[PDB]
């Protein structure tokens, strides 16, 4: 007798035991019984005028979209974070249209009001999308660096979310929509966006919530707006119980406690299936492990000295770096410093497609990490490198070379003609071990997983095989992709 | 050098309004003066312009309603990092 979507984000072993949520959307019906007295209408309003040739103010329900979303986040009976406190800003007109420039002015208003109210956690819900905007993504990043949790809709266009903003801003939590069968929502002939800029999915079809028709009325709605509102509710409950969760910690926990592999990825275009996280959001038991996430770069492009680069959040360490090419014409990957922070750069061959760089990004408190490299050796034992300093643990191995004529504890081994790069980290109680799995007849992929209690930090293929497309981590499983091949996982934990 | 940016989705473009983003560390009084200098340069060429907003706090710069004819002029202003043409966002 409770809405399917509220049940869906509530995990099996759920135990129900200061945060401001800002909503940038249409006007809202603040009198509605779901939100009465818990949502305050700020005086912020910056919207373009309606298209008057189609606008009949007498008939229009200007409050319908925002009221429903406020109810999904914090409604008394049907909300995710019931009774949570909210502040609404109007950046969409009655016809659901706004501007990048008005949205920026709304984000600046949030920044101003953050410096005035007592310091505390704030969530900003952005249930809107336009085309990729450099300025809008930059404003979102600057707010994220001030400790704001930004949550946004992936977009409703059955398209790559990286073409939309603020969906494409990396530090914003980008939410796609799934239905009661945990499949991607279709909306008309389109539906939820997908791709490497989506962080997770959440219920976004047939979502019951406050209707501005009347103060006690309810209505079902569908879209990635509704899904983002679910994750903003989840964030608000997490931050209500742990007010000094950082955004980075919050994002890793959202990823970690989501339902895995419940989506049939055949819905997505083939070349987006590896880029799109198979995650449906759920409330983490939380209230408090080594958390890691995979970060795919953009495709490098068919220039054949072109590079792809994958980066971690500021609070995270880059523990390993791999690469992938759909036809295997790559020159490997390299961990390198850029402004005193360590990035993952993959290199293209010299004919054809392009490459992805794939970073493994982890929350490792009080860590001091570094990369150590060895030039190509030209020796039968190959190129070797290892973490010489005491208490420095090997978390990942990278390898890049120069031209494609390759064919004949705590250490990295690579081809004779390749440079080899070791990620080494010092952290209290960090311990790591290697697991391997080899298959003589590789049917496209060989995998190996870390046991429960361990976290996959590094994923790699054993060198000396011309039939390797690349390697990447999927949660705690190392995945090597072939056209005898061995997958090599590095698994770590903390005390 | 200062670059110009616009929405890739052509029907979502809103030409005639521009966000001028100034280099990082630019102070409010310099954004304020850069906006007034753009207005004065454009007025000398026969163009009316409107400063709609001067940003400070998130990013430094300003919002200007003006003819796209003036983009080349605006790109040569001191402190300019890049200029973005306004565009639409939509309820999802």
């Amino acid at each position, epitope marked *: 007798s409770i809405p399917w979507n509220l049940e869906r984000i509530t995990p099996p072993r759920y135990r129900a035991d200061l945060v401001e949520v800002y909503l940038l959307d249409t006007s809202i019906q603040s009198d509605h019984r779901e939100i009465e007295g818990r949502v305050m209408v700020t005086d912020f309003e910056n919207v373009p005028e309606e298209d008057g040739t189609r*606008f009949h103010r007498q*008939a229009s329900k200007c409050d319908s979209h925002g009221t429903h979303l406020a109810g999904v986040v914090s409604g008394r009976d049907a909300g995710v974070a019931k009774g949570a406190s909210m502040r609404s800003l109007r950046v969409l007109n009655c016809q659901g249209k706004g501007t990048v420039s008005g949205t920026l002015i709304g984000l600046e208003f949030i920044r101003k009001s953050q410096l005035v109210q007592p310091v505390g956690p704030l969530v900003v819900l952005l249930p809107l*999308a336009g085309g990729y905007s450099r300025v809008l993504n930059a404003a979102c990043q600057r707010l994220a660096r001030a400790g704001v949790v930004l949550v946004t809709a992936a977009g409703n*266009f059955r398209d790559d979310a990286c073409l939309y903003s603020p969906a494409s801003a990396p530090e914003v939590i980008t939410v796609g929509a799934t239905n009661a069968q945990d499949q991607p929502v279709t*909306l008309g*002939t389109l539906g939820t966006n997908f791709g490497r800029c989506v962080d997770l999915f959440a219920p976004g079809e047939d979502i019951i919530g406050a209707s501005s028709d009347c103060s006690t009325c309810f209505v079902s709605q569908s879209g990635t707006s509704q899904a983002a509102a679910h994750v903003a509710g989840i964030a608000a409950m997490m931050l209500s119980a742990e007010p000094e969760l950082t955004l980075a910690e919050l994002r890793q926990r959202l990823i970690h406690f989501s339902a895995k592999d419940v989506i049939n990825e055949a819905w997505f275009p083939e070349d987006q299936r590896v880029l799109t996280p198979n995650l449906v959001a759920a409330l983490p038991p939380s209230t408090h492990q080594l958390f890691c996430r995979t970060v795919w770069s953009a495709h490098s492009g068919p220039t054949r000295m072109a590079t792809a680069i994958a980066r971690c959040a500021p609070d995270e360490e880059l523990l390993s770096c791999s690469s992938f090419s759909r036809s295997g014409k790559r020159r490997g990957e390299r961990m390198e410093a850029q402004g005193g922070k360590l990035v993952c750069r993959a290199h293209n061959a010299f004919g054809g497609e392009g490459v992805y760089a794939i970073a493994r990004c982890c929350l490792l408190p009080q860590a001091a990490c570094s990369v150590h490299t060895a030039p190509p050796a030209e020796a039968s034992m190959g190129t070797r490198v290892h973490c010489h300093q005491q208490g420095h643990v090997l978390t990942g191995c990278s390898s890049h070379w120069e031209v494609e004529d390759l064919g004949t504890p705590n250490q990295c081994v690579g081809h004779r003609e390749a440079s080899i790069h070791a990620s080494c980290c010092h952290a209290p109680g960090l311990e790591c071990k290697v697991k391997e799995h080899g298959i003589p007849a590789p049917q496209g992929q060989v995998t190996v997983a870390c046991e429960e209690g361990w976290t996959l930090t590094g994923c790699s293929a054993l060198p000396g095989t011309s039939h390797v497309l690349g390697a990447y981590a999927v949660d705690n499983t190392c995945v090597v992709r072939s056209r005898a091949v061995t997958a090599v996982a590095i698994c770590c934990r903390s005390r | 050098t200062a670059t110009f940016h616009r929405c890739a989705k052509d*029907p979502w473009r809103l030409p005639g309004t521009y966000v001028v983003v100034l280099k990082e560390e630019t102070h409010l009084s310099q954004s304020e003066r850069t906006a007034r200098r753009l207005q004065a340069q454009a007025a000398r060429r026969g163009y009316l312009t409107k400063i709609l907003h001067v940003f400070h706090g998130l990013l430094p710069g300003f919002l200007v309603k003006m003819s796209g004819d003036l983009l080349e002029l605006a790109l040569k202003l001191p402190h300019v990092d890049y200029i973005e043409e306004d565009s639409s966002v*939509f309820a999802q």
Partner: antibody
Amino acid sequence: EVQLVESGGGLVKPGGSLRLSCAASGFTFSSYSMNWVRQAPGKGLEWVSSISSSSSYISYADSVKGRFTISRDNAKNSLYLQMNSLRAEDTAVYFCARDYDFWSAYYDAFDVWGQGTMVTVSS
Amino acid sequence: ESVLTQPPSVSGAPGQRVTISCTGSSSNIGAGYDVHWYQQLPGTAPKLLISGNSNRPSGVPDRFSGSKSGTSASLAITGLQAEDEADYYCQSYDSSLSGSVFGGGTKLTVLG
């Protein structure tokens, strides 16, 4: 089973009035725009009127402007067409059809149609 | 007298390939709005056939394809079958009319 069922057709004299209705089931009606399309016997499809999910966009073919009024009631999962000052050339089958409301960001296909209700205007 | 122009009729024998054109103007197809196509079997409601210039709904065979270029669009049917005998309608939003207008329709006849 997504479904649209229009009703209210009949025979009417010129200058008369009729109210069509369209009942939706099996989908999230309040997130879809709705449309009337008509087809005179042996003729082509003619768009009549559209109304968005929150009624903030409403438009009309020129040929019916000022005589027809579209409205919807999301709580009753219903779409309406009030037709006044009917003329013989309004004789047609009237279909309702949905399109997901992208708030003018995209104009999608009419992906589900009803079966139509017949309207005859005759002296 | 429709805003989008289609040929009144087309025909082919089973197995042939036929095309149906749809030409508009700068206020609809030429303004960046997609073309959608509908098939109406005799005595039935229209059903969606191609959406967004070239996408096939579930249940529409890959014999049907669509494209769009400039102010014109085209529907192509390969491997013509008898059950393809029907009326075909293109559709597009027109910004000067504020509505999604229909072509005049094309009657497809299966010969032979």
